[PDB]
């Protein structure tokens, strides 16, 4: 947490969530989260401005 | 609430509901909620003759 940027205020690494691995056991439950999450990981990488 | 408006009955500045951010998390149904929300907008807009 202390070492997150390489400057402060240019962007962090991001982490996301699908599901708890038990609920989303299911492969096409698992599938629409991961489809799902892709969109904000597209989003949490723009807020970057990469 | 006394001064939304330049004059009165020209216009309203119009807020709008999307929901209450706790079951609104899960970005599919955060999704639906905005688009649906869009669709209310251009109606409030049109009335005011924008």
């Known amino acids: 947490d ?3 940027e390489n400057i402060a205020g ?3 690494p991001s ?3 699908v599901g708890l691995k038990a ?3 299911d492969p096409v439950k698992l599938g629409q989260a ?3 999450q892709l969109t904000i990981a597209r989003a949490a990488l723009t807020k970057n401005y990469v």
Chains 1, 2 share one sequence.
């Open 2 to 4: 202390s070492v997150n």
């Open 10 to 12: 240019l962007g962090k």
């Open 15 to 17: 982490l996301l969530e």
């Open 23 to 25: 609920d989303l056991t």
């Open 34 to 36: 991961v489809i799902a």
